[PDB]
Amino acid sequence: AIINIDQELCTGCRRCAEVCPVDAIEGEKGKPQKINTEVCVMCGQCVQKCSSYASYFDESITPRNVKLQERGMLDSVKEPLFAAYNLGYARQVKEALENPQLFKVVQCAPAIRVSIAEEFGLDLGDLTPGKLVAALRRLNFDRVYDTNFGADLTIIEEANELVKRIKEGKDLPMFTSCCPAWVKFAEQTYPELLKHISTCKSPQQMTGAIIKTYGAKINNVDPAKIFSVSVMPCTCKSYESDRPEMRSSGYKDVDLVITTRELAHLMKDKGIDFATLPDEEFDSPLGNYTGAATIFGNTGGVMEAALRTAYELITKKPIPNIDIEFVRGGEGIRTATVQVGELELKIAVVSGLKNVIPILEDIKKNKCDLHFVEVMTCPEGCISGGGQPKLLLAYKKRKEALYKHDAELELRKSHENPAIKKLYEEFLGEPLGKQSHHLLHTKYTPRK
Amino acid sequence: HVIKAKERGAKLIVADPRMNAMVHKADIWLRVPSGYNIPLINGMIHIIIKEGLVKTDFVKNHAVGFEEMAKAVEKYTPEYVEELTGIPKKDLIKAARFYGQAQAAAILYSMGVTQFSHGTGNVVSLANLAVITGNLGRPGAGICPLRGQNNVQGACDVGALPNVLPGYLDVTKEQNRERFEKVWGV
Amino acid sequence: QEKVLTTCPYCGTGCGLYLKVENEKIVGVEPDKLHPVNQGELCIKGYYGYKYVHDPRRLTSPLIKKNGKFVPVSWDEALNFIANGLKKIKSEYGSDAFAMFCSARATNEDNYAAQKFARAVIGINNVDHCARLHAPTVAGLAMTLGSGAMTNSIPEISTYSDVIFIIGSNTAECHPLIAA
Amino acid sequence: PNRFVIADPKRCLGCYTCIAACAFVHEEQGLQPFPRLYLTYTSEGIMPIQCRHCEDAPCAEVCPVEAIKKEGNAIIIDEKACIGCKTCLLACSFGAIDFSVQDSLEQSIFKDIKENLMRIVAVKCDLCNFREEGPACVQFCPTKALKLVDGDEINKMVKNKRTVNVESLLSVYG
Amino acid sequence: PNRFVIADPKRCLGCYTCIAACAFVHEEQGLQPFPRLYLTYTSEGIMPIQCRHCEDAPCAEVCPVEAIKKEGNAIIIDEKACIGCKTCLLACSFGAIDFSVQDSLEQSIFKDIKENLMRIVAVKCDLCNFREEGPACVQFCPTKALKLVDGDEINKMVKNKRTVNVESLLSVYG
Amino acid sequence: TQLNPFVVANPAKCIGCKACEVACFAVHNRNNHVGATVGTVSIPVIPRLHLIKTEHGTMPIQCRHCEDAPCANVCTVGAIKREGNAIVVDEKLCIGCKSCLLACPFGAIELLPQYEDGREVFQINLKLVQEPRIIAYKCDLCNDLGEPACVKACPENALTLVMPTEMKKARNKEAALSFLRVV
Amino acid sequence: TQLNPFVVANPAKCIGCKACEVACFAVHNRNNHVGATVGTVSIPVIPRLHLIKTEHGTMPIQCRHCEDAPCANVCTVGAIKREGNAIVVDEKLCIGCKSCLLACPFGAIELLPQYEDGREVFQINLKLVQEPRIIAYKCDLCNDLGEPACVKACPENALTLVMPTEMKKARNKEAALSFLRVV
Numbered sequence A: 001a002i003i004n005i006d007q008e009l010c011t012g013c014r015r016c017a018e019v020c021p022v023d024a025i026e027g028e029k030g031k032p033q034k035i036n037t038e039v040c041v042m043c044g045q046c047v048q049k050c051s052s053y054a055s056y057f058d059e060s061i062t063p064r065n066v067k068l069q070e071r072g073m074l075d076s077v078k079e080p081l082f083a084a085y086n087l088g089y090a091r092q093v094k095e096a097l098e099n100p101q102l103f104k105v106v107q108c109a110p111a112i113r114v115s116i117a118e119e120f121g122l123d124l125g126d127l128t129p130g131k132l133v134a135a136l137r138r139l140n141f142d143r144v145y146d147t148n149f150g151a152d153l154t155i156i157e158e159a160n161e162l163v164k165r166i167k168e169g170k171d172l173p174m175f176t177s178c179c180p181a182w183v184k185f186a187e188q189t190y191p192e193l194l195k196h197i198s199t200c201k202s203p204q205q206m207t208g209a210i211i212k213t214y215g216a217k218i219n220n221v222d223p224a225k226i227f228s229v230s231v232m233p234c235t236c237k238s239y240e241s242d243r244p245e246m247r248s249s250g251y252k253d254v255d256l257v258i259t260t261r262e263l264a265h266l267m268k269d270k271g272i273d274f275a276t277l278p279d280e281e282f283d284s285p286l287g288n289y290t291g292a293a294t295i296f297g298n299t300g301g302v303m304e305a306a307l308r309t310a311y312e313l314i315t316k317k318p319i320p321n322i323d324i325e326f327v328r329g330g331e332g333i334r335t336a337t338v339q340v341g342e343l344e345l346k347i348a349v350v351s352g353l354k355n356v357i358p359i360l361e362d363i364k365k366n367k368c369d370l371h372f373v374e375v376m377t378c379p380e381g382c383i384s385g386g387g388q389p390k391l392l393l394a395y396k397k398r399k400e401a402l403y404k405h406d407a408e409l410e411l412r413k414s415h416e417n418p419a420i421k422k423l424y425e426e427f428l429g430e431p432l433g434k435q436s437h438h439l440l441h442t443k444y445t446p447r448k
Numbered sequence B: 001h002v003i004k005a006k007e008r009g010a011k012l013i014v015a016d017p018r019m020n021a022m023v024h025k026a027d028i029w030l031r032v033p034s035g036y037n038i039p040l041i042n043g044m045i046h047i048i049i050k051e052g053l054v055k056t057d058f059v060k061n062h063a064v065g066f067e068e069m070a071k072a073v074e075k076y077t078p079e080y081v082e083e084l085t086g087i088p089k090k091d092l093i094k095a096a097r098f099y100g101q102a103q104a105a106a107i108l109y110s111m112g113v114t115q116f117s118h119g120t121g122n123v124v125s126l127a128n129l130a131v132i133t134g135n136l137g138r139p140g141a142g143i144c145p146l147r148g149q150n151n152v153q154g155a156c157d158v159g160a161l162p163n164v165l166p167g168y169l170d171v172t173k174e175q176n177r178e179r180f181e182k183v184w185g186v
Numbered sequence C: 001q002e003k004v005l006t007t008c009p010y011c012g013t014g015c016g017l018y019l020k021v022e023n024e025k026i027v028g029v030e031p032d033k034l035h036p037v038n039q040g041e042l043c044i045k046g047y048y049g050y051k052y053v054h055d056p057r058r059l060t061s062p063l064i065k066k067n068g069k070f071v072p073v074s075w076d077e078a079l080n081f082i083a084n085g086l087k088k089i090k091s092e093y094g095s096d097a098f099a100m101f102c103s104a105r106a107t108n109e110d111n112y113a114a115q116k117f118a119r120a121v122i123g124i125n126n127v128d129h130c131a132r133l134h135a136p137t138v139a140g141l142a143m144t145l146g147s148g149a150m151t152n153s154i155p156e157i158s159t160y161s162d163v164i165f166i167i168g169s170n171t172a173e174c175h176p177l178i179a180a
Numbered sequence D, E: 001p002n003r004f005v006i007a008d009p010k011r012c013l014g015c016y017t018c019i020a021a022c023a024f025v026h027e028e029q030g031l032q033p034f035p036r037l038y039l040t041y042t043s044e045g046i047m048p049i050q051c052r053h054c055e056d057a058p059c060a061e062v063c064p065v066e067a068i069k070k071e072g073n074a075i076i077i078d079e080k081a082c083i084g085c086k087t088c089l090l091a092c093s094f095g096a097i098d099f100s101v102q103d104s105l106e107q108s109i110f111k112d113i114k115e116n117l118m119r120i121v122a123v124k125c126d127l128c129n130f131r132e133e134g135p136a137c138v139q140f141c142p143t144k145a146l147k148l149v150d151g152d153e154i155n156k157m158v159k160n161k162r163t164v165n166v167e168s169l170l171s172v173y174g
Numbered sequence F, G: 001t002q003l004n005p006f007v008v009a010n011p012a013k014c015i016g017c018k019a020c021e022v023a024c025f026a027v028h029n030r031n032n033h034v035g036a037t038v039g040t041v042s043i044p045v046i047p048r049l050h051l052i053k054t055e056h057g058t059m060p061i062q063c064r065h066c067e068d069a070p071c072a073n074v075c076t077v078g079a080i081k082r083e084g085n086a087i088v089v090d091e092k093l094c095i096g097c098k099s100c101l102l103a104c105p106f107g108a109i110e111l112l113p114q115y116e117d118g119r120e121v122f123q124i125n126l127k128l129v130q131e132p133r134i135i136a137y138k139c140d141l142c143n144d145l146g147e148p149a150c151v152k153a154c155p156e157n158a159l160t161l162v163m164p165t166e167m168k169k170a171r172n173k174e175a176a177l178s179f180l181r182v183v
């Protein structure tokens, strides 16, 4: 299991039942509940809504030392333990770090650099890339990479996929493939529409696949001892990283993921302070990205990132489409119209998972034709995922910081990155070029 | 035993010129100066007579008279003893209410009244109060004196006074004198 | 569950009454729709006089007084004591040693048996009941009309309109169905 | 509107059967064992008096805890929330509310029955809405003095009296 | 928390046997014979006073020779190391420490008994940890006024009072 | 056990003269050196019934002496007890736990400082000055003393001591005579 | 002098979600490096109001701020003082006795270790380890800080800060208006 509910601490307040879209929480108005783990999409918002915290000044419960073994957390955290607990993977990361025979690489998501700063008494939403990378290299990690490389890769792949699908339209209302809880829900309840969803992999999986077979070629390390851990703000990528069909080049692309809170626990356990450390830069070969890949943490940023190159793919003329403010919001479903290549596209972006059900019907899809739809299960995007820290009960600071980081960089379109050009001219050739179908494409066939 | 009887249903009425551990645990403290308990008990009898709480069956069936004590207690009024003793007057009414409507009442007294010159009147008045309330010959009610030594009672059943013989018999009677003359010895 | 026809014993009118019994204990009482006297409705004592038969204080064993206190004692030796007491008093002073107080709230067979077993066993005319205190009425009516009891029948007083003359009116709270 | 019960004093013997039935039905149901129908003696006639279900109540307007409320077609006391503030006893014109106290019973046959058989709150005629049969008082009466009046029986009686008056005035003299 | 003992003043007769039982039991083991439980006469009530074991212990913060220490769940005075610097007496708010001097005994029955029967360091109720049985002051009281309290009993009493208060508030009015 | 009486006002014959509270204050505080004369009163005035005036006239309100009294039940310490026929608060054991003010819906209980022997009564350890002891004041129906003093002091004779048993019989007889004269 | 306000719960609108105690702990302990985020909490969690659930539902229990407070009277050191409109305990003069626990009938106070600057506090002379200093904990109505944090954090607004003076006037007016409209 991943999401559980302790029966010694749950009080039956039913609050967490009012936020998960699947309603997998079964119980009464009182008494402890239980998670229907066979239908849960692992979104994580039932964790952050929990507020039972039973202290250790009484001996009527477990002695709080064996509890840190069940939850999988570190033994030197001394933070309050809640009821709706995530499963912990920090101990296995620590044991892998103890072994000096593993060429260790780590990945950074475009929502950790803003989230981690609140874990050491700083301002909420302080953009700290340099401190994060310096601390990561001080955590005995041999290499640090950014998952935004795979974000640029999946932007190019999805743009080419949309250009291919706009000609001789076959299941044209295609959906984005960046939120694995959305894929799990679509395979759970609406199995007949799974071919609509694009066959492009999540950015972490492309990054891991490139690390395992291309990162082992630019270096002198065999692709058998590499230990890859991705830091994702999500109680959602662990299920994504252990599917039977989610491996390439023989081995797993991503071994096991850790959220922001587990990274903070590892940071505190090693006894390294955060404010004193200076700034540093990521590794050049697989850490150079653009601002279009930076806005995926916020909701709807995939749309600008895809359009900034889809416009050039369709019209073949460079005309500015850097910024749009009509698709940026925080709730419900948002719609827009785009005129490109003497073609009109009706675009929608959905924050949440329930708010796809009105536009997923076989009758409603025919009446709107939904030329491109972007979906995020967690509200307001991955900046409000399960990996983000508790808030003792805000969101706008993180998204404003991400947009400021996008506006600060001198590279905006996700096409001018020299690393992507070098990768295409050396290893992959052309997109959809009988090589990406083995490394960057998946077939969504659980048929659940 | 007295304080263990306070099973949320007992009523303690204590009268004491001094201060001890018993008066601090009683709801009613009828503190009276020494030697002024005779007007207090006379007013007690007067109040319980005036309220009409007298069990007439016992006095009619066993006692020889009722008006004899009424002739002596009607002289003393609650106000008369109020300025005679300097104590609140509502306390007497409350004590009468607690003593009268109850079924069993036990009266105790320590060495303080026994070592008094005029204790005969005190014990006679206490006996009269016990008779008039009908709380004699019943379990949990009656006059309950206390003895200051272990074997005083066994020094009364046998001869230990110059006017008594073993068996609660008086030596002034010649019949008891001739009752034991040879079995006793000389 | 089971219904038994009985006559209500609380007053002298007499009414049909179904003793609705269940698990051997009375659970209710019902009126008889075909009875000619009450016509299917009863007073307070008929409807709620069944809560008198199973009180927790019902006398459940014979007791005798030996030294001033009653003691639970079986039937046969108590009958021995009664028999020898009656025998000795009859031997001493004859058959006038007792006066029989037969109940007015018992069936006619009880009174007949009491009379016979006070007259055909020891033999005396000392039988009485506590319902004499209407005694001049039976004497007067016998001396006037030769009839010692009721003349007419109750349900005929309401079949058709008559003139009803009441002497010493307490029928409204002595027989709550005749006044009905 | 509301359903209630009325007793014409022509056929009431004062036999105390309706009062005892009303007490004992409520006792065996699980509510207060006290009767909610009071027998009153006057200079000319004896009539039982109960709660004529007032359509404005003058009762729910004085209850501070809001215990008295209209349910179905009757006024219900809701004994569980009643606290004992003797305010509805002031505002009842006919005096149809008494309180569950042993001393509230007058000396009669019913008192003897209830003492040979064996919370303080305001009890009122609830019209026996919990019982599938009709009211117990109207059903156990030896002379059928009480009678239950509905919303439609009032209209029928009004129409009958009105038609009789009109026909008599027409027939005799215009 | 620490364990201590309290006496509800409702059932204290002033019979002077708890103090003598405390004195002689401590005498027979070889400690200081003087008692460690005190009796106070007040205007309203008679209650024995003793060393409620201060969980922060202001006694040990002023002792200069470091002769007061926490053992088990009690405070121990370590009579072998006390010198008589009457500084712990100035810091004890309840005044539960007296000194082994014959003049410290007041005229009562216990003084007469001790006189007919026949080093100066601070003495204090050490809760009788040297005896396998409980305190001698709690199992000798003719009225059982004294009672020992631990952490578990304190928690039970707190929970009981809180639950009773909540149930009363729910039952009456929210 | 029988019904307890309670004094009730009469809005038709009340003016708002406040001459019924002063009698109550003067009759309860005989131990604070009052001699039925203004000038011997050396303490602040505390009545038991409270006069309230609104658009539809004015009237005094006080404790109705409930049988299932919420105030008695919520009092955890046990100050409020049904000692006599009426309900009375006890001044020795009250601690000022204000749950009474959340229990009574009429609002006939008010928390005010105590005054004994003509002086304010202070506490042992509080705040650097001392603080006065606060006690709950409510009507006790003059049980310790004689007949009620708010009555016999009302000039318009508005306040009445009603027993809820005789009033019910009177109303029943009135209704029976009114209905039986028409049928 | 004005009556001490206090917070009260509404049991009909409480689900026992335990989001009111966490806010209280997070708002008092700002000196222990808490940054409105779990992860910065390096101390045991200690609230001031305690949730309790019985078969008739659940609600929290907190200090009632008694006027004649027994917890202050019992304390011989005098650590408990009334500083403002609320009664507060002093964490510097507490000698850690437990006579303070035996007084309060509501049981809203608990003896727990003190935590300052994110670490346990240690005494000077006891036992070979040091026995941490332990202080009483009770609700102080957030007098040093702003408005109460138990209110404004409850999702259902079951907690309300009640002033026991205006309530009596409102109940008096309501009772008068209800009585005038009928009689």
Ligand code: 402
Pocket (backbone or CB within 6 Å): A109, A110, A111, A147, A148, A151, A178, A179, A202, A203, A204, A232, A233, A234, A236, A296, A297, A382, A383, A385
């Ligand atoms: N993989 C992936 Fe994504 C990327 O890049 C994350 O990391 Fe998101 C975030 N932050 C999460 O979870 S998933 C959905 N697309 C937008 S962002």
Ligand code: SF4
Pocket (backbone or CB within 6 Å): A003, A016, A019, A020, A021, A022, A023, A024, A025, A035, A040, A041, A042, A043, A044, A045, A046, A047
């Ligand atoms: S993980 Fe998400 S969907 Fe599953 S129970 Fe929790 S909140 Fe609901």
Ligand code: SF4
Pocket (backbone or CB within 6 Å): A005, A009, A010, A011, A012, A013, A014, A015, A016, A017, A032, A033, A049, A050, A051, A052, A083, A084, G017
């Ligand atoms: S939020 Fe926590 S305590 Fe409340 S029902 Fe869900 S798991 Fe239980």
Ligand code: SF4
Pocket (backbone or CB within 6 Å): A042, A043, A178, A179, A180, A181, A182, A233, A234, A235, A236, A237, A376, A377, A378, A381, A382, A384, A385, A386
């Ligand atoms: S928004 Fe991100 S963390 Fe949340 S379910 Fe989707 S992919 Fe997972």
Ligand code: SF4
Pocket (backbone or CB within 6 Å): C007, C008, C009, C010, C011, C012, C013, C014, C015, C038, C042, C043, C044, C045, C046, C047, C175, C176, C177
């Ligand atoms: S009138 Fe009543 S008491 Fe008499 S027999 Fe009939 S039911 Fe029984």
Ligand code: SF4
Pocket (backbone or CB within 6 Å): D007, D011, D012, D013, D014, D015, D016, D017, D018, D019, D048, D140, D141, D142, D143, D144, D145, D146
């Ligand atoms: S049952 Fe009928 S006759 Fe008997 S008292 Fe009641 S109303 Fe009168």
Ligand code: SF4
Pocket (backbone or CB within 6 Å): D062, D063, D064, D065, D066, D067, D068, D077, D081, D082, D083, D084, D085, D086, D087, D088, D089, D122
């Ligand atoms: S006695 Fe009961 S019904 Fe009457 S006003 Fe008071 S609470 Fe309401």
Ligand code: SF4
Pocket (backbone or CB within 6 Å): D050, D051, D052, D053, D054, D057, D058, D059, D075, D091, D092, D093, D094, D095, D096, D097, D124
């Ligand atoms: S109790 Fe009286 S006033 Fe109230 S509804 Fe019934 S009859 Fe009307």
Ligand code: SF4
Pocket (backbone or CB within 6 Å): D005, D021, D022, D023, D036, D037, D050, D124, D125, D126, D127, D128, D135, D136, D137, D138
């Ligand atoms: S209707 Fe029912 S409750 Fe009302 S008086 Fe008749 S029997 Fe009693």
Ligand code: SF4
Pocket (backbone or CB within 6 Å): E007, E011, E012, E013, E014, E015, E016, E017, E018, E019, E048, E140, E141, E142, E143, E144, E145, E146
């Ligand atoms: S033994 Fe008990 S009753 Fe006797 S003096 Fe000691 S505490 Fe008081």
Ligand code: SF4
Pocket (backbone or CB within 6 Å): E062, E063, E064, E065, E066, E067, E068, E077, E081, E082, E083, E084, E085, E086, E087, E088, E089, E121, E122
């Ligand atoms: S008298 Fe003894 S215990 Fe007290 S301070 Fe001095 S040495 Fe320490």
Ligand code: SF4
Pocket (backbone or CB within 6 Å): E050, E051, E052, E053, E054, E057, E058, E059, E075, E091, E092, E093, E094, E095, E096, E097, E124
């Ligand atoms: S001697 Fe006094 S100060 Fe020291 S622990 Fe005992 S009671 Fe506390």
Ligand code: SF4
Pocket (backbone or CB within 6 Å): E005, E021, E022, E023, E036, E037, E050, E124, E125, E126, E127, E128, E135, E136, E137, E138
């Ligand atoms: S615990 Fe021991 S030393 Fe302390 S008072 Fe009791 S008998 Fe004396």
Ligand code: SF4
Pocket (backbone or CB within 6 Å): F074, F075, F076, F077, F078, F079, F080, F089, F093, F094, F095, F096, F097, F098, F099, F100, F136
């Ligand atoms: S204020 Fe006084 S009377 Fe009211 S509940 Fe508290 S202690 Fe009892």
Ligand code: SF4
Pocket (backbone or CB within 6 Å): F062, F063, F064, F065, F066, F069, F070, F071, F072, F087, F103, F104, F105, F106, F107, F108, F109, F138
């Ligand atoms: S104070 Fe209020 S609740 Fe208490 S008895 Fe008086 S009126 Fe009733």
Ligand code: SF4
Pocket (backbone or CB within 6 Å): F007, F023, F024, F048, F049, F062, F139, F140, F141, F142, F148, F149, F150, F151
């Ligand atoms: S009845 Fe007596 S105590 Fe009550 S308000 Fe009137 S005068 Fe005051």
